């Protein structure tokens with residue numbers, strides 16, 4: 001105190017190394033969006049479970065070849081056929097209907113001509129097959145798509161709609177997944193009012209709590225609103241104890257610089273007995289960013305004490321907090337996606353690695369997107385974080401059009 | 413019937429032209445994620461509302477210049493100071509604290525040396541100012557960040573965490589936004605069982621309902637599960653009437669090809685009296701995709717009758733349905749984001765424009781991502797839809813490494 | 825704008 | 836992998 | 847064709 | 858240096 005300046009790269013790997021993976025629970029498959037499977041999932045049935053027509057047409061004997069055929073009836077979707085197709089006969093079929101016994105190929109309706117139908121016009125009676133069917137033509141054999149006993153999803157799979165649909169397909173409606181982190185957010189400062197309050201002398205509204213909670217909720221994680229806590233050790237300790245009790249992760253903002261009434265670091269170390277892994281980061285913005293762990297009865301709580309400056313708080317939440325939460329919910333590689341974009345504007349480099357919210361836009365047919373710093377464009381929310389390199393003797397400035405790293409923080 | 417083949421481009425502009433924008437409602441700002449403002453939002457207060465210190469240090473008179481100063485007390489965060497700084501005096505300040513009357517500049521603590529403190533060591537009494545302060549140095553004047561009467565967010569803004577935080581900052585906790593569409597999904601077919609069912613002869617599990625509902629829920633829209641409807645006109649009409657009653661949008665899958673018991677088009681036209689704008693699309697997959705509107709008492713309902721094939725159903729849901737829903741929830745440009753990627757694999761082109769789910773991956777420092785078709789990669793869900801061009805005399809094949817359009821369908 | 829994928833240019 | 840932005844290469 | 851050097855096209 | 862033509866590096 002003052003804590004050493006931690007490199008940005010050391011701070012980041014420290015968060016990922018020291019963050020735990022949460023335990024597992026069984027969920028309903030319909031709740032599986034963004035969850036990570038903690039089990040392999042196996043088909044207990046064949047898909048298709050019967051030989052299925054690929055086409056609307058006729059089930060035939062390929063050995064009959066082309067010619068004129070009696071239609072003995074129809075194989076209807078959802079019904080096992082009871083007839084056997086004999087030589088010179090066929091049965092109508094629709095897409096996904098079972099192939100009746102006696103038939104070994106399907107001929108699509110376009111390769112046929114109807115000869116005779118019922119007086120009512122509701123029943124086909126005789127058809128001309130115009131082609132020589134290949135054996136097994138336009139049939140999905142049993143287990144063509146999925147075999148009984150096949151592993152259809154591996155443990156470690158990060159599920160979206162198509163994985164949910166596969167769980168439905170194989171009838172595995174209950175699955176083991178990692179828990180989502182529960183994340184408690186508090187604001188600190190005697191100067192802060194609720195968003196709902198009219199201003200009073202010397203005061204401003206608390207924006208960080210709203211911004212950070214919304215940032216966590218955007219990624220699908222449950223949250224706990226711990227309110228505004230005054231600049232005093234006892235109150236801060238009480239709020240932190242409530243967060244540890246109710247949540248896996250505690251986010252504070254404010255009170256981490258070396259100011260007179262910046263108390264969070266003292267409380268985390270002396271009162272709470274947490275391990276502070278870093279208390280300053282060589283980065284812009286976010287110098288005072290603080291990361292702590294607290295082990296209670298073989299459970300690791302994680303604490304991010306972010307800076308009070310609203311821009312710092314949201315930038316550091318995106319860099320440190322979101323990857324940690326991804327790790328806790330079981331994502332094997334929790335690192336953010338980093339893309340290449342073109343700077344929309346000349347920018348001066350700082351001795352510190354520098355980060356700024358931006359909007360990524362793809363122009364007509366140019367391969368790389370443009371990054372426009374947020375500091376009609378105002379109709380869209382930030383979807384990137386510009387990652388600017390530390391200045392060097394070589395480079396003191398980057399020019400409009402230069403290719404830069406941008407971390408994805410938004411979902412178009 | 414058979415309906416004309418509609419070009420992919422005509423089908424898409426038809427959906428966007430004929431889809432309505434929903435009406436407005438007032439919401440709590442904390443519920444604003446993904447919503448579009450239907451009002452301009454104005455600051456009623458200055459930010460900062462008092463002259464604020466940028467730094468931990470001292471409020472001084474610049475005209476005093478450097479030298480030794482009596483510290484008359486401290487300006488504390490959240491408290492209006494009651495003292496006037498006179499010549500040869502200063503007052504301690506912290507970041508965000510008000511500047512007391514009499515002071516016109518801030519000198520950061522690093523540009524000072526402490527001369528004398530209290531016996532207890534809890535109180536600074538005299539300090540040496542080592543620098544000549546610039547006038548107004550390290551002070552945020554009233555209204556520096558936001559002025560009273562300023563428009564801080566325009567109508568048409570698509571809100572993320574930072575916009576929510578701005579609403580909090582200015583104390584506008586209730587805002588006019590567009591409604592979200594309510595989306596009803598049904599499956600069709602006598603062959604379909606619930607995901608929870610063991611298989612019976614001739615039957616398969618319904619996967620489309622799960623996949624489509626999950627796809628809609630991923631974008632934040634409320635859904636209604638209309639279940640499995642048999643292949644018969646009366647039941648289909650009853651289900652469609654329930655959907656029209658309970659929802660803004662009805663999605664069906666299955667029963668749109670020219671098969672014997674494919675009845676949806678007849679029911680939509682003759683029974684429901686809906687306007688079918690297209691019933692076939694020249695695209696792969698998704699030939700039978702059907703789009704209809706139904707105007708009841710000056711309300712426009714939209715109906716997507718997607719194909720039964722599970723791959724077709726999810727691909728067409730991503731191409732047609734999601735952009736429509738974006739339009740209905742007030743997004744001014746509802747078109748999906750299209751990026752340039754490199755093909756991971758040689759692919760044969762079809763006469764029809766062709767679409768396939770893929771995974772987008774950025775490699776070390778290569779500017780463009782790779783697109784790997786989904787038809788360790790299995791640990792991640794599809795985040796793109798490959799958009800392959802119709803074949804020509806020139807082009808019958810695309811090669812590994814060629815630059816292709818990929819529509820973003822996932823959020824890293 | 826087209827919802828149909830383009831052919832590769834400079835080719 | 837680095838969380839720190841790289842300098843532009845071929846430059 | 848121009849004997850005068852051009853500027854980078856998209857920038 | 859090689860007098861033998863190379864293959865495209867990343868492909």
Ligand SMILES: Nc1ncnc2c1ncn2[C@@H]1O[C@H](COP(=O)(O)OP(=O)(O)O)[C@@H](O)[C@H]1O
Pocket residue numbers: 095096097599600601603604616617618619620621665666667668669670671674700718719720721722
């Ligand atoms: N909900 C669903 N889940 C899974 N497979 C389905 C579903 N609905 C239809 N299918 C299958 O898709 C195929 C086409 O179904 P069908 O109703 O004929 O679609 P369409 O007439 O639109 O082509 C059949 O094999 C059918 O069994």
Ligand SMILES: Nc1ncnc2c1ncn2[C@@H]1O[C@H](COP(=O)(O)OP(=O)(O)O)[C@@H](O)[C@H]1O
Pocket residue numbers: 187188189191192204205206207208209253254255256257258259262288306307308309310507508509
């Ligand atoms: N919740 C918040 N919402 C908005 N502004 C805040 C919030 N918390 C702190 N700030 C402001 O950020 C600045 C820094 O606050 P401070 O508690 O000193 O942060 P730190 O000690 O981490 O630098 C001050 O101007 C403070 O008023």
Ligand SMILES: *C1=CC(=O)N(c2ccc(N3C(=O)C=C(*)C3=O)cc2)C1=O
Pocket residue numbers: 811812813814832834835865867868
């Ligand atoms: C790498 C391997 C490969 O075959 N390849 C490639 C690139 C580009 C093309 N192009 C065309 O066929 C037509 C235009 C074009 O750029 C073919 C093959 C690689 O980049």
Ligand SMILES: *C1=CC(=O)N(c2ccc(N3C(=O)C=C(*)C3=O)cc2)C1=O
Pocket residue numbers: 399400401402843845846854856857
């Ligand atoms: C367009 C305008 C411009 O100035 N510009 C540009 C591109 C690239 C660079 N580069 C460097 O300064 C160093 C490497 C490099 O590529 C400067 C300026 C445009 O592309």
Ligand SMILES: [Mg+2]
Pocket residue numbers: 188189190254255308489
């Ligand atoms: Mg504070």
Ligand SMILES: [Mg+2]
Pocket residue numbers: 254255256257258259262308506507
């Ligand atoms: Mg401070």
Ligand SMILES: [Mg+2]
Pocket residue numbers: 077600601602666667720
């Ligand atoms: Mg069907």
Ligand SMILES: [Mg+2]
Pocket residue numbers: 094095666667668669670671674720
């Ligand atoms: Mg059909």
